Amino acid sequence: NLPEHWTDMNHQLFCMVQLEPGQSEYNTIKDKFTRTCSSYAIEKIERIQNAFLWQSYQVKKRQMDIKNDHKNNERLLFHGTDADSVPYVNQHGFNRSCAAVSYGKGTYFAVDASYSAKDTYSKPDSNGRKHMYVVRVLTGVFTKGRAGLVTPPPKNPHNPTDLFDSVTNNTRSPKLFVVFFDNQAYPEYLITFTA
Amino acid sequence: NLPEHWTDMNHQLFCMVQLEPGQSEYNTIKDKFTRTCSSYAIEKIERIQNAFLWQSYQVKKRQMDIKNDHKNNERLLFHGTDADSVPYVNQHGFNRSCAGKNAVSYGKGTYFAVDASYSAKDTYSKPDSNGRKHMYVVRVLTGVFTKGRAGLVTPPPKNPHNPTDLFDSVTNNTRSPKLFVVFFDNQAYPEYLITFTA
Ligand SMILES: CC(C)Oc1ccc2c(=O)[nH]c3sccc3c2c1
């Protein structure tokens, strides 16, 4: 069930596709970034076409849509990372066992590209090039996080296995989300940019 | 679509089904267990019907069956755990983030035993306040494996010059495997829960 806007992969299961500047898809992703990062220069935007990661993510989305009963469970968020992690993320997605874990031992995603654009996250390589993913994240129903969480809290401690889907810094005005399971984040685009 | 021999769950997503001694399904698990745990006695065997865990697991199995070259990617293995962990495992499966350090570590992942005797140790299947011990029988996607090492947080690469092309799992010994370690969610489906006593 590979998305329409993906381009043909000649029966391959993984491809990175450089977007054509000035076309609708490139403009849409560029705008999401320049909303908070207009002072940064975009070198390129690549579409991540990973069939296996997409399949596993879409199964989790269908399950979360059933479990939560309607609800838009999905957010488009940012993740800054170092150049040496890019090949792993492209192929394998986001792994909590790799990665400050102030809101729990999960993978961290920012509402604003400006947050992920910090050198602590999108570490400049030898050439000054920084890397940030645009990520589909199953944030679902969320609560405030805290240090040391290995899974989100239960929605009521009377049923301690019925969990929140994610945690945040601030439930009323969230700026970051943490997810604790493989299959809850799909890296959709990679932005290569400079300060 | 769920396996046709499962009990009808009436639109619900999760059920534990108590098996009957004398049925082939009960007897094969009892025999697999008794092969190395003849000094213990089984109280009951429950089939775990978890729709969501099954779906995510079978997707990962189809992927590994495509990726690997006509490999038997799945083994039926044992996992001892404490009573306090059973409700979470039944609902959510095996979380590497919750796993204990093994007495012989081949990596930071979830451990599965070839022999019920290994999982039957009090260190893994901790007797509860009523003297009941708990052991899962688990479909594990071992796939293509190599000898593990204590430092691993993922399986190692097959080839050092291609760091992202990974082994599926690691073992203590490739020639005579007795345990397997997996490092990803939905690589292991908890199929049966054995409750047993001395
Ligand atoms: C409070 C703080 C820890 O939240 C964040 C927010 C965004 C990010 C990010 O974009 N990338 C990476 S890579 C390791 C950690 C983070 C991260 C952490």
Residues comprising chain A, all counted? 195
Angle of helix B51-67 versus helix A51-68 axis, rounded to 10: 170
- B94, two tokens: 């095996």
CB atoms within 10 A of CB B126: 16
Q: Which of B124, B102, B117 is nearest to B171 (CA)?
A: B102
Phi, psi at A116, each rounded to 5°: -70, -20
Tokens of B185: 């969610």
Breaks in chain A (C–N > 2.5 Å) following residue: 99
Q: What is the DSSP letter of A152?
A: P
Distance CA A120, CA A114 (A): 12
From the list B91, B79, B180, B60, the residue with the least C-alpha distance to B138 is B79
Asked if A93 contacts A53 with a C-beta cutoff of 8 angstroms, the reply is: yes
Q: Is the separation of the CB atoms in B157 and B146 below 8 Å? A: no
Give Rg (Cα) of chain A.
17
Q: Can you list the positions of beta strands (E) in B38-132?
A: 41-50, 74-81, 110-113
* Euclidean distance between CA atoms A80 and A114, whole angstroms: 10
Contact call for residues A131 and A191 (beta carbons, < 8 A)? yes
- Does residue B9 contact residue B15 with C-beta atoms inside 8 Å? yes
The DSSP letter of residue A3 is: -
Q: Is A67 exposed, middle or buried (0-12, 13-18, 19+ CB in 10 A)?
A: middle
What values do phi and psi take at B114, rounded to 5? -70, -40
**Does the beta carbon of A117 sit less than 6 angstroms from any atom of ligand 1?**
no
Q: How far apart are CA B156 and CA B164, in angstroms?
A: 9
Interstrand relation of B14-18 and B41-50 (parallel, antiparallel or unpaired)? antiparallel
Chain A residues touching residue B92 (CB < 8 angstroms) = 151, 161, 163
Residues in chain B: 198
CA dist B105 to A122, A164, B3, B125, Å? 33, 32, 35, 18
Q: Residue A97 is encoded by which pair of tokens?
A: 């066992």
Least Cα separation, residue A128 to chain B (angstroms): 24
Suggest the residue from A1, A11, A13, A52 to mutate for an interface test with chain B (most B CBs closer than 10 A): A52
3-state secondary structure of A134: strand
Other Cβ atoms within 10 Å of A86 Cβ, number? 19
- The CA distances from residue A92 to A173, B1, B41, B184, in Å, are 30, 26, 43, 10
Q: B110: which 2 tokens?
A: 């979830």
Number of CB atoms found within 10 A of residue A96's CB: 23
Give the list of residues 6+ apart from residue B114 with CB closer than 8 angstroms, or none. B75, B77, B78, B177, B178, B179, B180
Partners of A15 in beta bridges:
A49
Question: Is there an atom of ligand 1 within 6 Å of A94 CB?
Answer: no
Give the distance from residue B121's alpha carbon to the nearest chain A alpha carbon, in angstroms. Answer: 26
Maximal C-alpha separation, chain A: 53
DSSP string for residues in B19-34:
PPTTSHHHHHHHHHHH
Tokens 């995603």 -> residue: A109
